[PDB]
């Protein structure tokens, strides 16, 4: 009983300090910048070959090779320049929700509803792609696999927890807990020592991979958070929920900086990504199109459109040369 | 394509495309169905020709040169709003209700009015006729349905339960196909085949523009 009141006064103190630190909004301080105008992107490539809905996609570190999983049980690796299928990996379970591409390009992990994170080896001496490891230990559907290195991978599940694995041993090295709902998405910081996870309790909290501690937590969303992406310099992140709003939280200030809501937007955000500079906040909605938000004034600086069904995944290359979108109509489109 | 290695890469890509097309052609013969219902309702014991293969459970029995894949979503124990859209393309929903045991009506209401399955027809199975008929004599159908007024006979009670299960439809472009099953029944495959072919006929009718 006393612990409940202690928690209540702790939350009150945290909120009071958080409000005390706030002096001016981002939209007020940066009001003097020239608008970026209208950013028109044209479809340069259209990657076909998938025969079912696409849930995930990841870009190679070299910004030329892709990876995508769909309901057909196929894991296809594309050549984003000449539109060629380098590999075609058949999954054991057709229910897959999260691709991941290794930073070194050697491995590609691909897990989903079947509760395990299958890891595939691309550079084999036999010339084929083999499942190097199959990581088990989660009691719920998997989401947003991310590679730290060639032998370290972070996973998120519907078990209201995130886990850090060791591919060599295959055991759950560290487990992060504290969420009260299904954890839907995570993104790894460029410094590669912290990561943030967006759960179904309308809250995203920052984690530490080394200590396994919840350093920070962020609130403000009215519904389940569906995607998260870090700011390029590793000091902010943008979240997307079914509330049809995007928000920009800052790790140093511990508060949301601005909101990216438009009156004409009804459906929520499925995927969130930034640009290389950190000025365009691209977000995918359920109304079949993506809106490019100028991340400093919250004005729609163009619309991608072009897709027939819901956009399920976004991807911005490391050099920023392209933006690739995947949707449920089994078509990937590359924009520039 | 000018180089030799790029020509070989293009040939490899074309071979992969051909393999993908063949696999997709071979992946259209099957029929994807979804199993649902309360626990201990016989949702895993419909057809004796089971041939299965924590997570998702697949059953791939075949009939009349047609492959039926039953995805039993049981055991997930998570929020259905986040993965139920993975089954948007299922041909039908097989709902199993045990008459010998309100929760089932709640699931049925939730699954029938879901935004993903507004046009997906439902095949409703009422299991354990003998158990229900033996239990109704011992206890009248009034403890769970206090609004009942009709006769306590088996036929009228079963029809009343069927009526309350169909009353939650509340949607056009959807049909509920009903069937009464016992433990010692073998023709469930035939009933599923008729329901699936009827659903396919209706979908083709809608696509062709006839209605």
């Amino acid at each position: 009983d006393q612990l409940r009141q202690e928690a209540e006064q702790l939350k009150n103190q945290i909120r009071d300090a958080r409000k005390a630190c706030a002096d001016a909004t981002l939209s007020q301080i940066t009001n003097n910048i020239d608008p970026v105008g209208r950013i028109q992107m044209r479809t340069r490539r259209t990657l076909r070959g998938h025969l079912a809905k696409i849930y995930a996609m990841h870009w190679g570190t070299d910004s030329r090779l892709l990876v995508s999983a769909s309901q057909d049980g196929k894991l296809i690796i594309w050549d984003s320049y000449t539109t060629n299928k380098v590999h075609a990996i058949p999954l054991r379970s057709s229910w897959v929700m999260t691709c991941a591409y290794a930073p070194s390009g050697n491995y590609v992990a691909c897990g989903g509803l079947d509760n395990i994170c299958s890891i595939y080896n691309l550079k084999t001496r036999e010339g084929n792609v083999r499942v190097s490891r199959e990581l088990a230990g989660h009691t719920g559907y998997l989401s947003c696999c991310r590679f730290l290195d060639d032998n370290q991978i972070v996973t998120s599940s519907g078990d209201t927890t995130c886990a850090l694995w060791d591919i060599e041993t295959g055991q759950q090295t560290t487990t992060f807990t504290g969420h009260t709902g299904d954890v839907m998405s995570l993104s790894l910081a460029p410094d590669t020592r912290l990561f943030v996870s967006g759960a179904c309790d309308a809250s995203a909290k920052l984690w530490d991979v080394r200590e396994g501690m919840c350093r920070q937590t962020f609130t403000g969303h009215e519904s389940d958070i569906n995607a998260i992406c870090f700011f390029p310099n590793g000091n902010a992140f943008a979240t997307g929920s079914d509330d049809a709003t995007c928000r920009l939280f800052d790790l140093r200030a511990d508060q949301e900086l601005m909101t990216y809501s438009h009156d004409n937007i009804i459906c929520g955000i499925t995927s969130v990504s930034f640009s290389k500079s950190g000025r365009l906040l691209l977000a995918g909605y359920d109304d079949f199109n993506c809106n490019v938000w100028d991340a400093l004034k919250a004005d729609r600086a163009g619309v991608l459109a072009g897709h027939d069904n819901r956009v399920s995944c976004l991807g911005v290359t490391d050099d920023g040369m392209a933006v690739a979108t995947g949707s449920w109509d089994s078509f990937l489109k590359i924009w520039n | 394509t000018l180089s030799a290695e790029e020509r070989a890469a293009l040939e490899r890509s074309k071979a992969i495309e051909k393999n993908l097309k063949e696999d997709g052609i071979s992946a259209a013969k099957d029929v994807k169905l979804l199993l649902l219902g309360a626990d201990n309702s016989g949702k895993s014991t419909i057809v004796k020709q089971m041939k299965i293969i924590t997570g998702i459970v697949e059953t791939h029995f075949t009939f009349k040169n047609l492959h039926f894949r039953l995805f039993d979503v049981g055991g997930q124990r998570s929020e259905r709003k986040k993965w139920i859209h993975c089954f948007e393309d299922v041909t039908a929903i097989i709902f199993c209700v045990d008459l010998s045991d309100h929760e089932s009506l709640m699931l049925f209401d939730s699954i029938c009015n879901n935004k993903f399955f507004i046009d997906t027809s439902i095949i409703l199975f009422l299991n354990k006729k003998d158990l229900f008929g033996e239990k109704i004599k011992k206890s009248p159908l009034t403890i769970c349905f206090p609004e009942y007024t009709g006769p306590n006979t088996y036929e009228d009670a079963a029809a009343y339960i069927q009526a309350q299960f169909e009353s939650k439809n509340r949607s056009p472009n959807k049909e509920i196909y009903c069937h009464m099953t016992c433990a010692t029944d073998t023709n469930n495959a035939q009933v599923i085949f008729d329901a699936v072919t009827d659903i396919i006929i209706a979908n083709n009718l809608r696509g062709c523009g006839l209605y």
Partner: single-chain antibody
Amino acid sequence: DVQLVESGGGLVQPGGSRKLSCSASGFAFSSFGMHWVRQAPEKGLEWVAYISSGSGTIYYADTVKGRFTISRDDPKNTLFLQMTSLRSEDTAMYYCVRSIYYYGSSPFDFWGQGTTLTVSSSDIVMTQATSSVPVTPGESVSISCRSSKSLLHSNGNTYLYWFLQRPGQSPQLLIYRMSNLASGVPDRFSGSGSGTAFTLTISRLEAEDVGVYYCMQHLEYPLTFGAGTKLEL
């Protein structure tokens, strides 16, 4: 273990027909384009034939065009080579080489053990400046070979391959485009080049590194090898 072993060699009379079988075991045979490379006695390597994956595209050398026949048996994991008429110039040690082509692959990594065949009695020209170089261990060595055309394609990839043949063994790939190190070779190797002049350097040479170094172009068929530079100790 990847292993290519071939049989069918021996002494044959001129005008006869002989078939060589290259049996593969240890990799996905159906996904690898396979070549045939012959090495005349103390003369050097020379390309012969190539069959793509699935027997789609097949090429032949101008010397034996219309005279040899190459066939692929994917279920049996066997590669054949049928020759109709044999002259006295066909006597050589025939090698079987696998080649997989995609973005970032190593298309000459593994070579067969070699089979010896004896017979009783426009193109891109690659030239190697020196035929024999004596050197002591621990001293860097520079090997260079030129090409007639500029192998630097429009896509930025230069198709130059450097092979190493230890005495009594089969050639092994070291660098496949300009500096892309092969799988398992020591990191002391390094390669460079610009358009038509290319150089291979070996820092801290070891005693196991002596042999004959071949540079081959893959820009356009028929593939042509260099004269061959031999390291002496």
